[PDB]
Amino acid sequence: NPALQLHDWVEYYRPFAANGQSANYIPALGKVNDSQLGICVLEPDGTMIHAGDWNVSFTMQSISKVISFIAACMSRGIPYVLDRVDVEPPFNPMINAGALTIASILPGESAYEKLEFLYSVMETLIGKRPRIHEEVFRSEWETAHRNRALAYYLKETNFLEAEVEETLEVYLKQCAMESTTEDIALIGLILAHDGYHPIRHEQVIPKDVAKLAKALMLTCGMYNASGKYAAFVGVPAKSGVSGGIMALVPPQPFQSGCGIGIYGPAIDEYGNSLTGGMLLKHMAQEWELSIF
Amino acid sequence: NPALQLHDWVEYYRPFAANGQSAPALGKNDSQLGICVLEPDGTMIHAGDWNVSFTMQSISKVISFIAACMSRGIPYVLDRVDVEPKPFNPMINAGALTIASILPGESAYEKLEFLYSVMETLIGKRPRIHEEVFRSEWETAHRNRALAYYLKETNFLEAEVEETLEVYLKQCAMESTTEDIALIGLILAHDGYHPIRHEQVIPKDVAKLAKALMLTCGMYNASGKYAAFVGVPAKSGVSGGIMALVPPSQPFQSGCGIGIYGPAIDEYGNSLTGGMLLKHMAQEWELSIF
Ligand SMILES: *CC(=O)CC[C@H](N)C(=O)O
Ligand SMILES: *CC(=O)CC[C@H](N)C(=O)O
Structure with a gap:
């Protein structure tokens, strides 16, 4: 029951936001609430599950x-x-x-x-x-x-x-x-389906472009922690210093694949959401999301 | 028909060897090209110089x-x-x-x-x-x-x-030959489970760690290009070998280990004709993990 799990994991990981903090070199970004953590997962039949600060813009x-x-x-x-x-x-x-x-x-x-x-x-x-x-x-x-x-x-x-x-x-x-975790989970769902918009039922990105996008994410999406994420998470993912992570799983739970939008403004030394990273790793491990 | 396909693709890619070069004992045939693909049920398909040692x-x-x-x-x-x-x-x-x-x-x-x-x-x-x-x-x-x-x-x-x-x-x-590397590939494909012995020979988390390294750094300074145009974990050697694998996901529904051999090496240090064959298979059979 993924929804309950996600609620528990957000509860569990939210406190670790004390180990990093918000971005500083962009000052309007240093002003955000640092204990925030939220997540959305979108399935291709349009089912979505959210927990935490899933609807805060960033x-x-x-x-x-x-x-x-x-x-x-x-x-x-x-x-x-x-x-x-x-x-x-x-x-x-x-x-x-x-x-x-x-x-x-x-x-x-x-x-x-x-x-x-x-x-x-x-x-x-x-x-x-x-x-x-x-x-x-x-x-x-x-x-x-x-x-x-x-x-x-x-x-x-x-x-x-x-x-x-x-x-x-x-x-x-x-x-x-x-964006919200929702908008980035939708872009992630679309990438998972090779440029195919599973709600709109049309091809929105060419398949080969969407393949190049996924490869760059797995390969260089998490700054200098990309190999680490590839090794211990295994999901193509892209971070932003404002604490967003967009991730995705190609077609356990989420059999048809999914898009994932995560937000956790306290970032780590590599430049990735601290608590968002922790949560993603938990999900990947628990639900065996790794694509290799 | 994967086997006849592999035959025609080796035949087709073989000549391109002329664009490459072998690596001192390593410099002593340039145009060899072999492949072996192995599935968990034990069936193996092969073509070209698939049994040549290297x-x-x-x-x-x-x-x-x-x-x-x-x-x-x-x-x-x-x-x-x-x-x-560091x-x-x-x-x-x-x-x-x-x-x-x-x-x-x-x-x-x-x-x-x-x-x-x-x-x-x-x-x-x-x-x-x-x-x-x-x-x-x-x-x-x-x-x-x-x-x-x-x-x-x-x-x-x-x-x-x-x-x-x-x-x-x-x-x-x-x-080894293309065969031994195909087997190691299979085992890796199956997270360290040896599908012919039926035992766990590599811990799962070590096998995933392995595949991640291959995907990310297995092809030297073409690893990103492989991930983006082939999309299969792969590891090269300068003597013309490539070990590649497809995790269980029309063909190779259960996954596979791939062993390739093509001693003509490109500017990046990867088998020239081996990389072309692997790209063609990945593309033709939709093997990409992304
Ligand atoms: C990379 C990132 O998350 C923000 C990019 C930012 N505008 C920059 O420092 O270039
Ligand atoms: C990777 C590769 O094939 C080169 C290995 C070679 N013996 C070396 O320089 O260590």
Whole structure:
């Protein structure tokens, strides 16, 4: 009975949020409640189970990287994308440097138009246009030294296809798209089904793009803990420094597969939700979710 | 019809060997290509140079690592070696040498006996050391000796340098054919359960740890490219071998172990023609684990 388990596990793991804390280098993100922990799982017949702070909005942050990657592949095609970004753990698209490159190749002659495409791909997946947290965006834009450094770096080396301020606008706004555990569990369910939207009953991401997305998640989705998660959790997963984890299991419980949206704002030293990570590992182990 | 398919695909991919190169004893045929696929019910399909012997080379890092976990346990091994792409990753030379050094045994002979006893549990026999290969590695192994002393310096070797190097270069020179690697693959596919012996030969959590390493770091600097275009745990050796596996999930519904051999190596250190064949099978038979 997964629902009861998830309630107990959220109860159990919530206290460990004392071992890390919220993000600091984006100040509007340092202001969030640190004991928060929530989870949603979505099945392809539309059954969902949630527990904890499952319905608190947060910014997607690095989660948005898999969206823009997918959006860039749908727009320019895989070959175009893989010539400018690497798939090895030219920079990796899960990393800021690769993600900045990806932002700069989104179709359009301005930031606004690069972002309209992104937003419109995102509507396709979650069924609404997403809210941009301007407060979070504003504070990142003031303080984005490292990203402007990288972006000038990429531009010097011919890896950008937009101007710096433009690319940084698109990148910092995608990071500030807001989500619930619910929206990320749906994007995760869709990826589990190879770009097939199991509620809308249509193909929303091409299957090969969705395969490339899953591989990058398993391989580089959890920053510098990716091998660890692969070894002890075994589920393709993508974290964001705001404490979100998007994970998924391909088609125990959840036989037809599932999407998972987790939120736990206290993060660890690797940059991943502390309590969200603990919970995901528990589920993976208890319900034998590992895909190898 | 997987068998006729495997025949046609070996025939098709064979010539591409011309784009690659064999790795000193290792440089002495370029165009060989073999494959073996084994299922839990014991049926095996094979094609090309499927029964030609070769040295395991880096494929042995997987056995070594498994063997180190079994004796010392997972916690201890992971303090000394990293799981990511300071400790080094057991799939690269530095982490493989650390692993060799923490095998149990008061000597290089003992350590190797421990490794052969685990090897024999998997494959049903004691493996042969190609001493030609071993000895011509022994003499030209400067790079490996650099690393080993480095590791000793930084307290990440738990044995003596010459002793560690002997174990390591010896596991490298262990022999197999596509067949033995297909069997190890199957067992890994089945989480350490040996489907023909019907016993648990590797603990489950060590086998998962193994597969994760393969998926993540088994193909050197093409591991991401494999995961994204093949999507099957795979481990290469510089002598042209690839061990791959498919966990139980139209064909190979129960999973399988795959052994490939193609001595023409690409820029990345992976069998050129072996990688192409594996990609074609994964793609044609929808083997990807993602
Ligand atoms: C990676 C992540 O979770 C947030 C990305 C953030 N905007 C950055 O530091 O680049
Ligand atoms: C991985 C591989 O095939 C190289 C092993 C080789 N003997 C070495 O350099 O240690």
